[PDB]
Amino acid sequence: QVQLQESGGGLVQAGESLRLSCAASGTIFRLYDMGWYRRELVASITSGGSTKYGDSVKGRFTISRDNAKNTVYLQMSSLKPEDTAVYYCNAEYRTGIWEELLDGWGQGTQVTVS
Amino acid sequence: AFLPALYSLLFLLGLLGNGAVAAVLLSRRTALSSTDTFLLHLAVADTLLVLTLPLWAVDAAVQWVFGSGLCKVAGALFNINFYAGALLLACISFDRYLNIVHATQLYRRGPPARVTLTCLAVWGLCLLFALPDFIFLSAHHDERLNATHCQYNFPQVGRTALRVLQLVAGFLLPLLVMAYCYAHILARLKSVRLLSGSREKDRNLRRITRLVVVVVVAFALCWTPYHLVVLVDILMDLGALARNCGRESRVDVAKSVTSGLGYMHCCLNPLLYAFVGV
Ligand SMILES: CC[C@H]1CN(c2nc(N)c(C(N)=O)nc2Cl)CCN1C1CCN(Cc2ccc(Cl)cc2)CC1
Ligand SMILES: CC(C)CCC[C@@H](C)[C@H]1CC[C@H]2[C@@H]3CC=C4C[C@@H](O)CC[C@]4(C)[C@H]3CC[C@]12C
């Protein structure tokens, strides 16, 4: 009962920067966690603004969140051909005040460099 | 006519439901949760009020004939059902507050039978508060052409004091305790990710809180009009406002209908435990 809209993927030249935006809609009481995964996490942000990055990321990527629109953004700079992969948006949500916390993955997007 | 019929219907339904739930809970009595045993005790505090219906049925049929002792017992049971309900619900809401906010429960990981002694204490307080109804009730003939009807008999000097103390205690200690506990529970529960750390010890906690909150909302919605009526009465007796000697019929019929609603709460509880929670 959650629709995830993903945008930003597409053709791009090497040595450039890209911006991936993931938005969530539906009957949601609250959103708690968000992040991006390739089966491993690349960047995660909580509701409190804390940011976590994987061991393969040297702080290059920037993760931002907007709770007004409930939309997460990930900016990647100095892209490399090795970054060509599939990224899946993730989100943890509670649909009701008395309901179990459960997460729903996204469709996914393909990123190719050079 | 219709009143004995509906009293008999209420007696049958309430006895069946409450006996069923008591037997179901007691079949596994070797080990019970705090919420489970509080519900068991507020059901055994209700089977008695269910048992006392046929007396009122035959009273509404022809006339009270049982005597003074049965009248005392019936009045005390009606006045003790509310005290037991209010104190048990206040205790269960405080237990929910302890589990949710502080997360430092000790009923099950502490002393083996803290809950049992708390329930015994609330029973003792209920009996002590019901003593004034034990000591001032009698089946006075009233010399009203064969109209031996149960009614209070006070020296009229302490009636207002007794009524105001009853109202203050039984509808201001539990009310304030429950309001504070549920305000804190809701504030802590609207702005948290996981209670403790899990997804299996967090869902059932919310389910239990849902069950307890619907139970207390039903109890409040059933037992509030009677205490509002008695508050109107005690304010009338203090010469506050609206004393005109024309609303006596209204307050009497209000007391009757609110007593009926309080009698219905007994049969409302088991179906509530039935359809929600399965
Ligand atoms: C705060 C609102 C109310 C209902 N409630 C909610 N909890 C929620 N979680 C939500 C939600 N929409 O999420 N809404 C609500 Cl109303 C918790 C309990 N509470 C009190 C609890 C107190 N009692 C009054 C009372 C109690 C006992 C007696 Cl003897 C007499 C009078 C009145 C009701
Ligand atoms: C007000 C007068 C007339 C009524 C007499 C009070 C009676 C009904 C009260 C006082 C002591 C109470 C008991 C105290 C403790 C327990 C143990 C519990 O595991 C089952 C209920 C049970 C057995 C209670 C049932 C109700 C009880 C028997």
Residue numbers in the entry:
A (entry chain N): 3 to 40, 47 to 122
B (entry chain R): 54 to 331
Lines from the paper:
Nanobody Nb6, which recognizes the ICL3 of κOR, was coupled with the chimeric protein CXCR3κOR after purification in a buffer containing antagonist SCH546738. Single particle analysis of the cryo-EM dataset finally yields a density map at a nominal global resolution of 3.6 Å for complex CXCR3κOR–SCH546738-Nb6. SCH546738 is a noncompetitive antagonist, suggesting that the binding pocket of SCH546738 differs from CXCL11. In the density map of CXCR3ΚOR–SCH546738-Nb6, no continuous density could be observed in the central pocket of CXCR3. By contrast, an omitted density between TM5 and TM6 was found suitable for accommodating the small molecule SCH546738. In the structure, SCH546738 is trapped in a hydrophobic pocket surrounded by TM3, TM5 and TM6. The central of the hydrophobic pocket, formed by Phe1353.36, Ala1393.40, Phe2245.47, Leu2285.51, Met2315.54, Val2616.41, Phe2646.44 and Ala2656.45, contributes to stabilize the head of SCH546738. The tail of SCH546738 stretches out the central pocket and contacts with Tyr2355.58, Leu2395.62 and Val2586.38. The assay indicates that mutation of Val261 and Ala265 to phenylalanine may reduce the space of the allosteric binding site and interfere with the binding of SCH546738. As the repacking of TM5-TM6 is critical for receptor activation, the insertion of SCH546738 between TM5 and TM6 may prevent the process and constraint the receptor at an inactive state.
